[PDB]
Amino acid sequence: LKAAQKTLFPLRSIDDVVRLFAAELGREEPDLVLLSLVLGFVEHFLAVNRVIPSPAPDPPGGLTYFPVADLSIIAALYARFTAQIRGAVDLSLYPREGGVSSRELVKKVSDVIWNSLSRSYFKDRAHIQSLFSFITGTKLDSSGVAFAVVGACQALGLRDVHLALSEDHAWVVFGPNGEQTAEVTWHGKGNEDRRGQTVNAGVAERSWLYLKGSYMRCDRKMEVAFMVCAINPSIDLHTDSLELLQLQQKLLWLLYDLGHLERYPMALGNLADLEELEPTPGRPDPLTLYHKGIASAKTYYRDEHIYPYMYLAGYHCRNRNVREALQAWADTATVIQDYNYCREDEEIYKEFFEVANDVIPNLLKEAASLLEASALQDPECFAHLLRFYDGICKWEEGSPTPVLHVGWATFLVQSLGRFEGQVRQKVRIVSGTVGPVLTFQSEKMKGMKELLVATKINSSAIKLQLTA
């Protein structure tokens, strides 16, 4: 460690950590191994191992604390990690070809990391994301392995190796222009031995997992941003650390300012979420951020991301804004329609499944409930519903893995049924194969163009055509 790094210790508050980050984000190459270790300590001591009549016998408004991270302690771990790597990778053996790293060099560093993790631990477990987990607990989650491979590679001065993130996966980029791709970790319930391979199969397969190639490739600073997103404030299932929430917000705002969330639509959503809980005065209102997130995706990722829209759908949902909610979840469908469902897309299916068969059925349930003594009379809100299912039907077309079945059918019908026939009527539907006017891309929906507007819903026959 350098003098400037050491001076900023000990860390005795949340702002001391922002300083370290601010100090460390000023430098060409920020120290990832230092910043994941510090985040790891504080999270472990604020979430993994929490310590928690007049006068009340306990502080009646609650209590918040900071674990003092001492230089003594952190440097111990930093020296551990660096010793471990430098020890088990001999750079003399891999010809560094002028500023550029070998696939053989990356696979090596990945193996060192991979071979250091414990034989046996539940991988879905929380608070194993940091390098602190890796060093003091010899455990990392899927994406945590990827980070450590990049953290490790930084320590060996492989400036060209960097983190790649989709919406549900992490791997590495090296070589000339970040052109070279390598898998360094696993995915889902037991599956991914893909380790060492190129990503080109998964980009061409058209799987949501690899975003048809519109994935994030991080400069060192975007790697820091990730680190901060990966901060996990949950203590148990009922409660969150008010400390780790305040820390993620202050550090996301720092990285926002320094322009390091420009190409990070998820981080931007995370911050809109934190702003919604606890607005920091001065700053953008959540919706602005929610939109800066969609902007990002349309601009730097060909509008091939789903979360930016999910993030927004949710704000409006929570804010009982029924139209804008359905409008967003519609944009969601319209983005996934141009994809395919594949083995390791399990995660985004879970989420579409949830809105189609829980969230929307309940917003509309509640919406219908407020009629009895509006959204359900607006034929646009209805057209957002239809543009949603149409996007999901198209997704499925060509996909190896069927999507819609039995369960989806009952809930479509319940959803369809919240809108009067006189309302649904006004939505003009053209069926382009080659009141609101709406186009359908999906053969399933064009296969009920005149059933979805019928005054009597032929529930039975819809369930039929929605599921073969």
The separation between CA 316 and the C-alpha centre of its own chain, rounded to angstroms, equals: 19
Bridge partners, 306 (sequence order): none
Cβ–Cβ < 8 Å for 240, 233: yes
How would you write the chain as a 3-class SS string? CCHHHHHCCCECCHHHHHHHHHHHHCCCCCCHHHHHHHHHHHHHHHHHCCCCCCCCCCCECECCCCCCECHHHHHHHHHHHHHHHHHHCCHHHCCCCCCCCCHHHHHHHHHHHHCCCCCCCCCCCCCCCCHHHHHHHCCCCHHHHHHHHHHHHHHCCCCCCEEEECCCCEEEEECCCCCEEECCCCCCCCCCCCCCCCCHHHHHCCEHHHHHHCCEECCHHHHHHHHHHHCCCECCCCCECHHHHHHHHHHHHHHHHCCCCCCCHHHHHHHHHHHHHCCCCCCCCHHHHHHHHHHHHHHHCCCCCCHHHHHHHHHHHHCCCHHHHHHHHHHHHHHHCCCECCHHHHHHHHHHHHHHHHHHHHHHHHHHHHHCCCCCCCHHHHHHHHHHHHHHHHHHCCCCCCCCCCHHHHHHHHHHCCCCHHHHHCCEEECCCCCCEEECCCHHHHCCCCCCCCCCCCHHHHHHHCCC
Token pair of 287, please? Answer: 């919706």
Show Cβ contacts of residue 131 under 8 Å, excluding neighbours closer than 6 positions: 33, 36, 37, 40, 77, 81, 147, 148, 151
Q: Pull the structure tokens for residue 421.
A: 């026939």
Q: After which residues, if any, is the chain broken (C to N > 2.5 Å)?
A: 52, 373, 434
Task: Enumerate residues 6+ apart whose C-beta is below 8 A from 189.
Answer: 346
Report the candidate in 148, 152, 141, 146 with the shortest Cα–Cα distance to residue 89: 152
Identify which of 257, 350, 277, 336 has the alpha carbon closest to the alpha carbon of residue 304.
336
Residue with tokens 């979840």: 329
Contact partners, residue 347, CB within 8 Å, separation at least 6: 168, 188
- Domain limits of the chain? 1-468
387 is written with which tokens?
A: 């543009």
Count other Cβ atoms within 10 Å, centred on residue 331: 20
**Residue 278 CA, distance from chain mean position:** 21
Which amino acid, residue 465? Q
Distance CA 359, CA 336 (A): 18
Q: Are strands 428-430 and 216-217 parallel, antiparallel or unpaired?
A: unpaired
Cβ contacts of 360 within 8 Å, gap of 6 or more: 326, 329, 385, 388, 415
CA distances from 249 to 46, 93, 132, 245, 273 (A): 16, 43, 21, 6, 9
What whole-number distance in Å separates Cα of residue 453 and Cα of residue 468? Answer: 21
- What gap in Å lies between CA 104 and CA 57, rounded to an integer? 62
Separation in Å, CA 349 to CA 209, 341, 356: 11, 8, 10
Q: Under a CB-based contact definition with an 8 Å cutoff, are residues 152 and 113 in contact? A: yes
Contact assessment for residue 207 and residue 306, using Cβ atoms and an 8 Å cutoff: no
- Provide the angle, in degrees to the nearest 10, between the axes of the packed helices 379-396 and 322-336: 20
Phi, psi (deg, nearest 5) at residue 340:
-130, 150
Q: At what angle do helices 32-43 and 220-230 cross, to 10 degrees?
A: 10
How far is residue 25 CA from its own chain's centroid?
A: 23
Rounded to whole angstroms, how far apart are CA atoms 6 and 29? 17
322, 189 contact by CB (below 8 A): no
Evaluate whether 451 touches 398 at the Cβ level (below 8 Å).
Answer: no
At 430, give phi and psi (nearest 5°): -90, 155
Distance in angstroms (rounded) separating the CA atoms of residues 18 and 424: 53
